């Protein structure tokens, strides 16, 4: 009967907690207590991109690290050349309320979706020269919150329907549905190997999914509110998570638990987006407060702040070359930052 | 700049021209969020105004003012994340099935949830107490009564400034304005005056509802600018 299963659930949760406490021999704060402080990272807005018309909800970098997709409530995707600030493409969306976009590792495609509960795959490199919808992925039964390409033909796609799905773009069908979540899946990050991904949800949990085996490899539950944001550490064996509670937390896959919690009492508002730098040494977190703070990911102290935005910083991204962090906000502007010594 | 850079900046300028045209479209368009449970008949309101997909954009126009009304639907039963998008709509329209008393309580709690939400602290709600004909019929049949569900309807008696329709019975007036007052108590409770609730009684036979929403948005924007000007 049900009571036996609910009890064995409690027992197995206790077993998991005991194994984690057994592994918790030392904190990251202790092991990194003697590593050098990174010091103040006075990043500067090298470019402001001014073309969007409403609240920007998402951006994603190309692997080329200069092209930059950006989605806004206006129902546009703009492809930006970050270097020149040029608008490479402006894509009229079939729905205004886009909430995620992705740029394919090839840059042949950009994905976006939102309250349409549909991801439109847009072919950037048509012979007809206009950008057009390559596929219109449907099967999600709720809003579409994040998507990331694995390949020109595969996209992983989280939804408020509490599921993530892997899609075969050439056939428009879900090749795997990930269904252990119990709340709106808000955030999604592919491992650099693309064989694993983490997805964070409003059940305050992050889950690690095997893309091809199809099952929850393990589950992370340290947060107190909705995990708005998630990002793998570039080693691919830890990931950061940003919540409605003002903390972000770094979970190690192999230690199966929080290494570190990034929080400061001056910060009382939700984290909106999270990205690591190429070394993983910086964790960059966007906030409801219009700042995005830079954290020492090892020591957990506020190495800096990017303060130029006039509204909620909705999305962060570091280039794959690491040369810059882009930052979109609800003020419709998209700022690219680096220091220059 | 290279010739190709010159042409790419030309392209960026041309896209900026198109984005400026869409800025004209987008600021002339007023966005509305059409909330309400499945009983509310909000789909009938959509149909009568127009004459697995997660959102339906009902475009309509009154006196050359364009309105886009987003009937959000086929979403899951937690709204608390996607309502963050509709910050900076001109209004939320919240259709209530006035007839469905047992679901009227969850409609009230859902109104409280919208009104109190940190992202909606400034977004006015146009209540459409729909199915007012079915409500009239139910009360004139008398088989089940508000008193079975809200005992304060003994203490409550019609406002001194209620204005019944000529064929409207005073008990229908009592039910109407009690439901209204129930919502208004929440609104006048939590509202700092950043945002106000504009109840209208309506039925499926209303052609006027586009005019209603036009007038309500006009009042919302006037009150908003006057608050900004410290005149209200």
């Amino acid at each position: 009967e049900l009571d036996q299963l609910r009890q064995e659930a409690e027992q197995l949760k206790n077993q998991i907690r005991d194994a984690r406490k057994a592994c918790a021999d030392a904190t990251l704060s202790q092991i990194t207590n003697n590593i050098d402080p990174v010091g103040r990272i006075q990043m500067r807005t090298r470019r402001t991109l001014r073309g969007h018309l409403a609240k920007i909800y998402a951006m994603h970098w190309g692997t080329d690290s200069r092209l930059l997709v950006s989605a806004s409530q206006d129902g546009k995707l703009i492809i930006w050349d970050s270097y020149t600030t040029n608008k490479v493409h402006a894509i009229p969306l079939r729905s205004s309320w886009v909430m995620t976009c992705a740029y394919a590792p090839s840059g042949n495609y950009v994905a976006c979706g939102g309250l349409d509960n549909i991801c439109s795959i847009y072919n950037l490199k048509t012979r007809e020269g206009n950008v057009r919808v390559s596929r219109e992925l449907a099967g999600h039964t709720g809003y579409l919150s994040c998507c990331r390409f694995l390949d020109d033909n595969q996209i992983v796609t989280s939804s408020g329907d509490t599921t993530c799905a892997l899609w075969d773009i050439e056939t428009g069908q879900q090749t795997t549905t990930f269904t252990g979540h119990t709340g709106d899946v808000m955030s999604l990050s592919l491992a650099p190997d693309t064989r694993l991904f983490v997805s964070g949800a409003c059940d305050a949990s992050a889950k690690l999914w095997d893309v091809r085996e199809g099952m929850c490899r393990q589950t992370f539950t340290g947060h107190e509110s909705d995990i708005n944001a998630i990002c793998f550490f570039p080693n691919g064996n830890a990931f950061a998570t940003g919540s409605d509670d003002a903390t972000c937390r770094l979970f190690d896959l192999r230690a199966d638990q929080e290494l570190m919690t990034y929080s400061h009492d001056n910060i009382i508002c939700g984290i909106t987006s999270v990205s690591f730098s190429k070394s993983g040494r910086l964790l960059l977190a966007g906030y409801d407060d219009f700042n995005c703070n830079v954290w020492d990911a090892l020591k957990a102290d506020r190495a800096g702040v990017l303060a130029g935005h006039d509204n909620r910083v909705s999305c962060l991204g570091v280039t794959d070359d690491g040369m810059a962090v882009a930052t979109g906000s609800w003020d419709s502007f998209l700022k690219i930052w680096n220091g220059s010594s | 700049l290279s010739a190709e850079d010159k042409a790419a900046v030309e392209r960026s300028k041309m896209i900026e021209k198109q984005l400026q045209k869409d800025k004209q479209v987008y600021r002339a368009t007023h966005r509305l969020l059409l909330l309400g449970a499945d009983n509310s008949g909000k789909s009938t309101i959509v149909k009568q105004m127009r004459i697995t997909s997660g959102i339906f954009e009902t475009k309509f126009q009154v006196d050359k003012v364009n309105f886009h009304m987003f009937d959000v639907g086929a979403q899951r039963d937690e709204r608390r994340k996607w309502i963050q998008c509709f910050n900076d709509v001109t209004a939320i329209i919240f259709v209530v099935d006035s007839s469905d008393y047992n679901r009227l309580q969850e409609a009230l709690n859902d109104f409280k949830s919208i009104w109190n939400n940190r992202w909606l602290r400034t977004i006015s709600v146009i209540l459409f107490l729909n199915k007012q004909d079915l409500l009239a019929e139910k009360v004139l049949a008398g088989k089940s009564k508000i008193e079975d569900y809200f005992p304060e309807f003994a203490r409550y008696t019609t406002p001194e400034d209620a204005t019944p329709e000529p064929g409207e019975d005073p008990r229908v007036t009592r039910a109407k304005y009690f439901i209204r007052d129930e919502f208004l108590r929440i609104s006048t409770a939590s509202g700092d005056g950043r945002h106000y609730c504009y109840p209208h009684f309506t039925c499926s036979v209303d052609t006027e509802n586009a005019r209603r929403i036009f007038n309500d948005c006009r009042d919302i924007i006037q009150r908003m600018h006057l608050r900004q000007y410290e005149l209200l």
């Epitope: 490479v88 206009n130 | 190709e4 030309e10």
Partner: single-chain antibody, 230 residues
Framework: VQLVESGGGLVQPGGSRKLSCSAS????????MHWVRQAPEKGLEWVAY????????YYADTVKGRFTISRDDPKNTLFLQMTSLRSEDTAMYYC??????????????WGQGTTLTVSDIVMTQATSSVPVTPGESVSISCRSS???????????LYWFLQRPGQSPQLLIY???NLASGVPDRFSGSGSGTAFTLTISRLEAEDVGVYYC?????????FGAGTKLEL
């Protein structure tokens, strides 16, 4: 995609003729358009350019006072109104689309051409012809009087192949970058001042005249072309 040029035939000297080109199946308004002409026995020569939205218009000095290029985007039709035509304007005139954004391949599609009979950086291709065999790993040299490496890092040498009965076709846009449709049997390399196309295994579809072209600055000159003879 089907650029089809119309007009042409004979004219008397001093005459006037309006060439046109219907764009057919592509987003013509978003492309810049070029006219390029080929004299009966000679290499390609750029004639005129009109941007998307007609903002930029550029001409070669051989036509600058004489030809006017215009476009009707609602019709998806390009025009070249020629005036004061002269014997040196006798050519096949190719309409050539171009699109300019990071990573774009301009000059990627060429129309069938219309023949008209009237009754700068220098690109040097010192090989007027090379005799070649199937499977041979042939290379085509090109040289420039100005370094085509711009400070933005691009090296604006394009390579075109004109097969004996066809229009030119883009092979390489920047000196490294192969076009989206072309065999990786082709490759390009260069120093900004000197350049090679390479064809690691020839086949009969590679027979033709190979033109290098600079897009560093207008007037956008082509080379004399290297013929490959099988």
């Amino acid at each position: 995609v089907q650029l089809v040029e119309s007009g042409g035939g004979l004219v008397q000297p001093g005459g006037s003729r309006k060439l046109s080109c219907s764009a057919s199946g592509f987003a013509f308004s978003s492309f810049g358009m070029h006219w390029v002409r080929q004299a009966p026995e000679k290499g390609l020569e750029w004639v005129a350019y009109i941007s998307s939205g007609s903002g930029t218009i550029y001409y070669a000095d051989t036509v600058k006072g004489r030809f006017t290029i215009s476009r009707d985007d609602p019709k998806n039709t390009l025009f070249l109104q020629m005036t004061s035509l002269r014997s040196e304007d006798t050519a096949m005139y190719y309409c050539v689309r171009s699109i300019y954004y990071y990573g774009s391949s301009p000059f990627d599609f060429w129309g069938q051409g219309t023949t008209l009979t009237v009754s700068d950086i220098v690109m040097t291709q010192a090989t007027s012809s090379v005799p070649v065999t199937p499977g041979e790993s042939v290379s085509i040299s090109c040289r420039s009087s100005k370094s085509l490496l711009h400070s933005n890092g691009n090296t604006y040498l394009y390579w075109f192949l004109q097969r004996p009965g066809q229009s030119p076709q883009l092979l390489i846009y920047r000196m490294s970058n192969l076009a989206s449709g072309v065999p990786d049997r082709f490759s390009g390399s260069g120093s900004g001042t000197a350049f090679t196309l390479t064809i690691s295994r020839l086949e009969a579809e590679d027979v033709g005249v190979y033109y290098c072209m600079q897009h560093l600055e207008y007037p956008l000159t082509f080379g004399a072309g290297t013929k490959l003879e099988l």
